């Protein structure tokens, strides 16, 4: 009996069996409903579409994400996603081997309680556990001292882990993410006179951002270069066949991670919160956290975000204590790979929340047994 692992990404679910190298199922966590009167009788319609169903039909649909900012906002959509995950794509009855689910830290208590409830009552899973993603990124990167910048959709957070101990008071959480990058990128593209106004083309701008964006190693010289010369501009075929051409706007979007002030965000960016997260730590460990400094999650995939982070923290750190970055190319999957190895540890098999214990203690069980 091999456990299941699936990751409740705020944008893209990742699922497979424990001890697999990379997930078998990957599909956007998106639920599509038709918004038009279909005329044909005998069409063979169905009510609504999940994941890879709703991508191809998106022009006909309205698309909702049930998860925003690591919070499951519509559990009735969410159930459909899990149902599709286990039965349709995996071809597994979840009742027959256990399951592991992954969460951003410090999200509201209900997300754990109601996820556990739905797992035991609805799917009748043998046993369950939930785990902090930025813990698993260290299992994935092969380390036990770490500071982790984790950014998916929805959430960015810093969690320090020194020699296997977490430091709860040092956790930083922030709400810049690929969604707010995209919703900024549409408004900056409007400056060129391109318009994207409904959900079915948000999924176009997301692909534009994925292919073309990059981060300036130093921003203001390259902003002036773009104002000086067009050699930065590159062009993209919209799905119909209309070309669009984009210039400084492609780097200006991922800059907002470093200057959230463009979004109108209150906080500092991921560099200065990373440094403040180290500054919360005691002075014995900071030297080690500067070396084992890890990038995790897909929003960290922009070309050059590593070298930009290394530069801008080097300008904050003491000159003598050298600082490093770790940014493996897999890292989009690293939270899953870490969950896959974690679930397969013989030592872990005691840790599962079994259904008997849940029936004893109720949905409150999670906070007691789990981190």
């Amino acid at each position: 009996t091999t456990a299941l692992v699936c990751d409740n990404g705020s944008g893209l679910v990742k699922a497979g069996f424990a001890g697999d190298d990379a997930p078998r199922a990957v599909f956007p966590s998106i639920v599509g409903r038709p918004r038009h009167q279909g005329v044909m009788v005998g069409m063979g319609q169905k009510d609504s579409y999940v994941g890879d169903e709703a991508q191809s039909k998106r022009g006909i649909l309205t698309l909702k994400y049930p998860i925003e900012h690591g919070i499951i906002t519509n559990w009735d959509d969410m159930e459909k996603i899990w149902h599709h995950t286990f039965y349709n794509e995996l071809r597994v009855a979840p009742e027959e081997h256990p399951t592991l689910l992954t969460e951003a830290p410090l999200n509201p208590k209900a997300n754990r309680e109601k996820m556990t409830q739905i797992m035991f009552e609805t799917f009748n899973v043998p046993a369950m556990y939930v785990a902090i993603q930025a813990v698993l990124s260290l299992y994935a990167s092969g380390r036990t001292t770490g500071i982790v910048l984790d950014s998916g959709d929805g959430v960015t957070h810093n969690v320090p882990i020194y020699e296997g101990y977490a430091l709860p008071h040092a956790i930083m959480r922030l709400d810049l993410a690929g969604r707010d990058l995209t919703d900024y990128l549409m408004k900056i593209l409007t400056e060129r006179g391109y318009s994207f106004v409904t959900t079915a083309e948000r999924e176009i701008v997301r692909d534009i951002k994925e292919k073309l964006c990059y981060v300036a190693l130093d921003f203001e010289n390259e902003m002036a270069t773009a104002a000086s010369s067009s050699s930065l501009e590159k062009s993209y075929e919209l799905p119909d066949g209309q070309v669009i051409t984009i210039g400084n706007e492609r780097f200006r979007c991922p800059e907002t991670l470093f200057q959230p002030s463009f979004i109108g965000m209150e906080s500092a960016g991921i560099h200065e919160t990373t440094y403040n997260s180290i500054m919360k730590c005691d002075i014995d460990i900071r030297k080690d956290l500067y070396a084992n400094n890890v990038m995790s999650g897909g929003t960290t995939m922009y070309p050059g975000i590593a070298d930009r982070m290394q530069k801008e923290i080097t300008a904050l750190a003491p000159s003598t204590m050298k600082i490093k970055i770790i940014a493996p190319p897999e890292r989009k999957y690293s939270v899953w790979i870490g969950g896959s190895i974690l679930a397969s540890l013989s030592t872990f098999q005691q840790m599962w929340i079994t259904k008997q214990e849940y029936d004893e203690a109720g949905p409150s069980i999670v906070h007691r047994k789990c981190f």
Binding site: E68, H69, I71, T73, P108, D175
Partner: peptide, 7 residues
């Protein structure tokens, strides 16, 4: 969420 933000 429930207050300080859309969710």
């Amino acid at each position: 969420w429930x207050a300080x933000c859309p969710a």
